[PDB]
Write a protein that binds this ligand. Structure first.
Ligand SMILES: Clc1ccccc1Oc1ccc(Nc2ncnc3[nH]ccc23)cc1
Length: 294
């Protein structure tokens, strides 16, 4: 097989010492590096300068646009050379995909589910607010922080598959007739399955699928490998069935996102109220242990 894009031990730009590969994402690799200017560990994403689909230009654009916002890594640096392109950003902790898989039945409690869900909704409204769609909402794109002050904060980790959906003014851009989906079958909306231009609502469908998987431990199309079979299930599926194990106000959430299309701005305050009201009804407070603490 092919070697890692970077050799562990090298120094990037006389500053970032590559320590270990920590992931092999969709379109590149991620490393733990030592930043010798700040004397801290950081995350270093890289892609080959020669690979057919390169997304780190999008990663840098969105990370920069989101600086100052919650739920996003601090931007540290970026560069392009004949061998590779790279982006450096804040290193986070345990990934939600791993935390969920460590649970007894791959389920989180409603306490952990509601708090994570509300943080993730905040992160989606934030990326939409600067004119980008995420298009790849799934548990492995979120992690908790790795310090006492950050480990109760959930971070949106990656923006590779993002698309700008507005003008400078906030005008929604005319959709393409066909849009070739490159994200994850399991959490993709029907519109992704249909190679339609994705909208703000498609990120909220993916959040709805994540929340259901958190509470139930699986989605109805878990064992189906064929993308066009999954899509056929989603097209026909009565999503009200997924309300069974969610707090009652999720009927409002589901009715709202069902009403949306590419050209309709979500009612983010309504969707936030579903989480706020559910959290109060269930007596959840922010300091309650998450499932992985206790
Ligand atoms: Cl590929 C995968 C699938 C499922 C569960 C974990 C996985 O591994 C990683 C490893 C690292 C990341 N990303 C990050 N991690 C830690 N700090 C980070 N700052 C920015 C990104 C980033 C994501 C998934």
């Amino acid at each position: 097989e092919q070697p890692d894009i970077l050799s562990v031990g090298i120094l990037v730009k006389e500053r970032w010492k590559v320590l270990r590969k920590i992931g092999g994402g969709g379109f590149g690799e991620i490393y733990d590096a030592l930043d010798m200017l700040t004397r801290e560990n950081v995350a270093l994403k890289v892609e080959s300068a020669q690979q057919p689909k390169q997304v780190l230009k999008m990663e840098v654009a969105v990370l920069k646009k989101l600086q100052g916002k919650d739920h996003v890594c601090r931007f540290i640096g970026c560069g392009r050379n004949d061998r590779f392109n790279y982006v450096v950003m804040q290193l986070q902790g345990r990934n939600l995909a791993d935390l969920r898989r460590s649970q007894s039945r791959g389920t989180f409690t409603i306490s952990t589910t509601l708090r994570l869900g509300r943080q993730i909704l905040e992160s989606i409204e934030s990326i939409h607010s600067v004119g980008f769609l995420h298009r790849d909402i799934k548990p492995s794109n979120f992690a908790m922080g790795r310090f006492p002050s950050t480990c109760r904060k959930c971070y949106m980790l990656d923006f590779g598959l993002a698309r700008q959906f507005t003008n400078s003014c906030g005008d929604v851009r005319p959709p393409r007739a066909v849009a070739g989906f490159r994200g994850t079958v399991r959490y993709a909306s029907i519109n992704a399955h249909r190679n339609r231009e994705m909208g703000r609502h498609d990120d909220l469908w993916s959040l709805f699928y994540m929340l259901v998987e958190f509470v139930v431990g699986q989605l109805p199309w878990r064992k189906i490998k064929d993308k066009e079979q999954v899509g056929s299930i989603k097209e026909r599926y009565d999503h009200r069935l997924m309300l069974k194990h969610l707090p009652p106000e999720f009927s409002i959430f589901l009715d709202h996102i069902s009403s949306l299309d590419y050209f309709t701005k979500p009612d983010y305050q309504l969707l936030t109220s579903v989480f706020d009201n559910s959290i109060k009804t269930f007596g959840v407070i922010e300091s309650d242990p998450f499932d992985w603490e206790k």
